[PDB]
């Protein structure tokens, strides 16, 4: 009943994993980088990186590890998806044709089990004897690494330790020994076990259970000749081997917890460590026996998710928050930067120069990596604008030719009873700054600001600092009532560590004119202003479980007109004409209609299915798109011509799909220069730096494209032999349904890349006619 089309305009740029080895050949040094659903292979050369192949999988890369079984010419790769699809891959090159082959594939998802709190864990034995997985608390899944196990059959072993923090394999051990750190009521402990394949069970570990730091978070497998394992926490770094125990407490790392690492020297003499604040440290192990440990801070890079050593002092910093980096070490110098739009929290479509070809402005990054990105078409052109503080929302003003952005910096509590910023940000280096009219240690405090930036130079023209213990939540830029001036409207909430639900808040109206920001009007509310929208000259806002409409008086103030006390918390707010859509964090959706004649609201329809909603948007007067838990997209529809009042007041889930991305913002417009087959245009931004476009289709076009989807799946080789129908299926921990009312744009566009004999096989009901159709579709982004 819905019929929609979803395509990817920008590939996900966020790096969630990286590994090194010899994948293409035993001589070439390979570096593999995972970007959620994409995998990129590079050859480490003396100059830099040499791109060879970029593949797209039908699964969210959760675990990615390289290994070499005895007898094999080169390393094989193992990938495990979010939907528990495991596959072993090999690289094959026959002259100039590069294809990635699948040696073994299969699903390991158990019918019953509680997914672990510390997520999916995947490890491989040093001698490549088996693959160990941790998917459910108390169950350790083992997959034998045999040639005959093409189906990847696995078996579970019962664990008494339920809350296991981390687990790794040990080196120099005759038996496949696992060393893991877990927690129990007595504290956190390290324990070892021997995995027996003949017994399909566990045997007594080589060493006894030792008590460790209560904040022990990471485990590192030490290779020969040292052996044993390293345990990293918030304040301590320990080494265990059985009879050998070393413990150091370097004060240099107490500032932040270490989260990622990688091996520098294959013998185990040097390791790299990365913290949450972007600092890069070097761990050095002295030597037959371990004499002592040493940690030296090397410098500051991007906030890393993973790390890897390449050779000749070259290191790769795989970041999820900021741009990925390639650096040089002189044991840090930035050699190369790779744009990372993830995480996108909010964006807007603006016609800056051409006034016909759209441009996108997004709030990307977080903390010191916080930045703004400007995207347009020529391959896409991107312009980076660093901020060095977390951006939140955005808005554009044509009348004043400037952007308004909500930002938040982190300051630390001073001993003298004040605050101090860590590094220079946009709010501290503003050409002009200001503060609001005040009312009412080492800890971190979030200082909120509103920045006014020029559209050409991107300079921080103004920076307004909000009140203490106040959080900016929403932002709109529009004209209200009969006033020709365009204002910046902000919604706030008073946050206190003692009040769980806020009981105070403000709605402030500012005007930017002649280079000065002035506080025009202020209205107090007894709750949080979650969202605001322009509604036919008036200002619609949400306060806790209420929706309020304000009118801009001649005296330049705001007057309440009507109220609607909703059964749910009004987080999301969208509008079109006289229709308003309200949504909460648990997919509870409600529709309202402002009656102009009556001057009040009316509940139209609702659908309360509990699932974590991430964002919502109005397609048209009958269809509504939302993104929810497990990276899914759902579309609801109302029926105005329904015969019963019960049918009209209910919303039908007419569209379901699994995107594989966590959407955060929706926008109306397009980036292409404006008998078109696509009606409507809705852009969306995610967390992994992926940008996509969704549109509505006609019945005939939907039927043709769905038939084409099935025929294409029969010929296109899947990375890891994973069925496309299963990858695009709406999935949650309790229910898994197939996609309905949607068309995968990437699969439809992939028709142009395949060979001509395969093109003919697909259209065997005319290959050139379908090429023209797909070309017209590609011209939308």
């Amino acid at each position: 009943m819905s019929y929609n089309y979803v395509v990817t305009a920008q590939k996900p740029t966020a790096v969630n994993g990286c590994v090194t080895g010899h994948f293409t050949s035993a001589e070439d040094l390979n570096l593999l980088i995972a970007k959620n659903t994409r995998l990129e292979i590079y050859v480490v050369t003396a100059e830099g990186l040499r791109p060879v192949k970029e593949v797209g999988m039908y699964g969210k890369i959760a675990v990615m590890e390289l290994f070499r079984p005895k007898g094999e010419s080169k390393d094989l790769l193992f990938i495990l998806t979010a939907k528990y699809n495991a596959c072993i891959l090999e690289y094959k090159q026959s002259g100039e044709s590069i294809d990635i082959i699948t040696r073994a594939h299969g699903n390991v998802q158990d019918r019953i089990g509680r997914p672990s709190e510390t997520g999916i864990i995947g490890i491989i034995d040093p001698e490549c004897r088996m693959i160990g997985l941790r998917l459910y608390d108390g169950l350790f899944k083992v997959i034998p690494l045999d040639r005959d196990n093409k189906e990847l059959k696995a078996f579970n072993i019962r664990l008494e330790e339920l809350h296991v923090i981390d687990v790794k394999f040990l080196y120099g051990c005759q038996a496949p020994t696992i060393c893991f750190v877990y927690q129990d009521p007595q504290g956190r402990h390290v324990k070892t076990y021997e995995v027996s394949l003949r017994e399909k069970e566990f045997n007594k570990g080589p060493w006894k259970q030792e008590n460790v730091e209560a904040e022990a978070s990471m485990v590192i497998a030490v290779p020969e000749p040292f052996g044993g394992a390293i345990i990293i926490g918030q304040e301590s770094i320990t080494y265990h081997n059985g009879d050998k125990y070393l413990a150091i407490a370097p004060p240099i790392i107490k500032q932040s917890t270490i989260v990622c690492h990688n091996r520098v020297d294959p013998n185990g003499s040097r390791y790299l460590l990365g913290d949450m604040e972007g600092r890069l440290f070097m761990l050095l192990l002295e030597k037959v026996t371990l004499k002592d440990l040493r940690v030296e801070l090397l410098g500051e890079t991007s906030i890393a998710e993973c790390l890897t050593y390449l050779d000749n002092g070259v290191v790769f910093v795989g970041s999820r928050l900021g741009d990925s980096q390639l650096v040089k070490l002189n044991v840090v110098v930035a050699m190369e930067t790779f744009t990372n739009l993830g995480p996108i929290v909010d964006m807007c479509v603006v016609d800056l120069e051409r006034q016909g070809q759209g441009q996108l402005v997004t709030c990307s990054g977080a903390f010191k990596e916080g930045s703004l990105r400007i995207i347009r078409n020529g391959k896409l052109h991107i312009r980076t604008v660093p901020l060095y503080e977390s951006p939140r929302k955005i808005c554009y003003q044509e009348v004043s030719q400037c952007f308004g952005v909500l930002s938040s910096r982190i300051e630390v509590q001073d001993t003298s009873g004040g605050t101090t910023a860590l590094r220079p940000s946009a709010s501290t280096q503003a050409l002009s700054s200001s503060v609001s009219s005040s009312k009412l240690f080492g800890e971190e405090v979030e200082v909120h600001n509103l920045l006014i930036i020029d559209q050409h130079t991107f300079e921080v023209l103004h920076a307004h600092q909000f009140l203490q213990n106040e959080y900016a939540l929403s932002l709109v830029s529009c004209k209200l009532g009969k006033d020709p001036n365009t204002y910046f409207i902000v919604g706030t909430a008073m946050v206190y560590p003692e009040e769980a639900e806020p009981k105070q808040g403000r709605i402030v109206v500012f005007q930017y004119s002649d280079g000065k920001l002035q506080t025009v009007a202020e209205k107090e509310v007894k709750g949080a202003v979650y969202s605001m929208v322009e509604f036919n000259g008036k200002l619609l806002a949400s306060i806790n479980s209420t929706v309020r409409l304000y009118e801009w008086t001649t005296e330049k103030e705001l007057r309440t007109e009507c109220n609607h006390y909703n059964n749910i918390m009004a987080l999301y707010l969208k509008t079109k004409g006289d229709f308003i859509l309200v949504g909460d964090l648990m997919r509870s959706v409600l529709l309202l209609a402002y009656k102009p004649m009556e001057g009040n609201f009316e509940e139209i329809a609702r659908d309360f299915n509990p699932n974590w909603m991430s964002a919502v948007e109005i397609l048209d007067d009958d269809n509504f798109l939302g993104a929810e838990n497990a990276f899914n997209l759902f579309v609801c529809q109302k029926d105005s011509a329904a015969t019963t009042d019960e049918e009209r007041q209910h919303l039908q889930e007419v569209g379901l799909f699994h995107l594989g991305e966590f959407v955060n913002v929706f926008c109306h417009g397009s980036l292409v220069m404006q008998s078109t087959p696509t009606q409507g245009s809705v852009l969306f931004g995610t967390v992994n730096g992926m940008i996509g476009l969704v549109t509505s289709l006609s019945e005939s076009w939907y039927n043709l494209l769905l038939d084409m989807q099935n025929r294409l799946n029969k010929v296109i080789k899947s990375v890891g032999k994973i069925e496309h129908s299963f990858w695009r299926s709406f999935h949650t921990e309790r229910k898994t349904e197939p996609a309905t009312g949607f068309i995968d744009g990437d699969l439809i566009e992939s028709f142009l890349d395949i060979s001509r004999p395969k093109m003919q096989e697909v259209v065997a009901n005319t290959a050139d006619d379908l090429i023209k159709v797909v070309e017209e579709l590609t011209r939308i982004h």
């Binding site: 997520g119 927690q183 209560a214 990471m218 059964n567 509990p610």
Partner: protein, 381 residues
């Protein structure tokens, strides 16, 4: 404060020990089951709530005998309109204790049952023998993982386990919801939708009523915890029906906390204007909570709430210790000063050494929760 909270939970007033059953019969989710309904049961049951019953009619006794050998499970309809026997939802009840007594030539049966699963009514049929059956669909318990599971970075997955309680909660919020900066919302918002935070806020409200620690008395499972909290909250039938409709434990806990903060007054259901008591006077005299279901000599069930003080009430008759639900106390009928409707009973200690010397027991069916100042009734989430 020296009564013994374990005395009422046992329901000693029913007499000699009963034949207990422990086998748990639980049907699949969304499965269709045809289960008989008890006719004189006008109470709205909650899963995990104890329900005592004393049956007299031969049809009721025959149905009980037939169920003792079968699955021992019957249904309890949530009568929206008790007059026309209309019910859209309901709860299953499993008999966990039974004892037959042929006192005075009449078949008397004493049964203790417990709630199990919620359900949606599909069809109601009445057989030729008077007793009625119900074609029902089991409502699923929608369990959701932590809101951070979908945004959580792989590197920070290992920092999700955690070992001045206020300082601990601040650290918990900064650590568990660290990845919240990747979304359109802040940490404090997700804290409102976190099972542990909600449970702790409810625990802080519960400690105000009783000094029993939450290490043992309260369950750790948020589903069982939510059902236990709902079972002892004095609300009207319509709000109870709405709360039962909820599928997720998170929404149930959110609604409970909201009701506990909003409804600070408790007025007469018939009067609507006569204030009877406030939540400040509420205290837990039983292990289940301040409110629990009790059966009277004539088979009528009362979800009675124990409070310290009550006003606008007149006492009818003289104190008696016959069939008392609270051993060592004498009851006296209490009526509303204006409408003269039965509200509950006044319990007075028989011995001077007992503490408290006097308290009030109010029936839920005769009370109405009221929000102070001027506004209508609404229950978020």
């Amino acid at each position: 404060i020296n009564f013994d909270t374990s005395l009422p939970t046992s329901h000693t007033y029913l007499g000699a020990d009963m034949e207990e059953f422990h086998g748990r019969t639980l049907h699949d989710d969304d499965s269709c089951q045809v289960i008989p309904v008890l006719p004189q049961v006008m109470m709205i049951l909650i899963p995990g709530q104890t329900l005592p019953l004393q049956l007299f009619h031969p049809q009721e006794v025959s149905m009980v005998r037939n169920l003792i050998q079968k699955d021992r499970t019957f249904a309890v309809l949530a009568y929206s309109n008790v007059q026309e026997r209309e019910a859209q939802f309901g709860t299953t009840a499993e008999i966990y204790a039974y004892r037959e007594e042929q006192d005075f030539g009449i078949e008397i049966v004493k049964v203790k049952a417990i709630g199990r699963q919620r359900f949606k009514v599909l069809e109601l049929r009445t057989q030729s023998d008077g007793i009625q059956q119900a074609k029902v669909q089991i409502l699923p318990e929608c369990v959701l993982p932590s809101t951070m599971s979908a945004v959580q970075l792989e590197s920070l997955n290992k920092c999700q386990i955690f070992p001045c309680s206020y300082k601990w909660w601040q650290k918990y919020q900064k650590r568990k919801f660290h990845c919240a900066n990747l979304t359109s919302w802040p940490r404090w918002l997700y804290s409102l939708y976190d099972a542990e935070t909600l449970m702790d806020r409810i625990k802080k409200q519960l400690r105000e009523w009783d000094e029993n620690l939450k290490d043992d008395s309260l369950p750790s499972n948020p589903i069982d915890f939510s059902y236990r909290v709902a079972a002892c909250l004095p609300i009207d039938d319509v709000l109870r029906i709405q709360l039962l409709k909820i599928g997720s434990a998170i929404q149930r806990l959110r609604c409970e906390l909201d009701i506990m903060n909003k409804c600070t007054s408790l007025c007469c259901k018939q009067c609507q204007e006569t204030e009877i008591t406030t939540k400040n006077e509420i205290f837990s005299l039983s292990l289940c909570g301040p409110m629990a279901a009790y059966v009277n000599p004539h088979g009528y069930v009362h979800e009675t709430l124990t409070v310290y003080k009550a006003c606008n009430l007149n006492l009818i008759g003289r104190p008696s210790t016959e069939h008392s639900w609270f051993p060592g106390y004498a009851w006296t009928v209490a009526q509303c000063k204006i409408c003269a409707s039965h509200i509950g009973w006044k319990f007075t200690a028989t011995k001077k050494d007992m503490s408290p010397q006097k308290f009030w027991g109010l029936t839920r069916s005769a009370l109405l929760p009221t929000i102070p100042d001027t506004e209508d009734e609404i229950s978020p989430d």
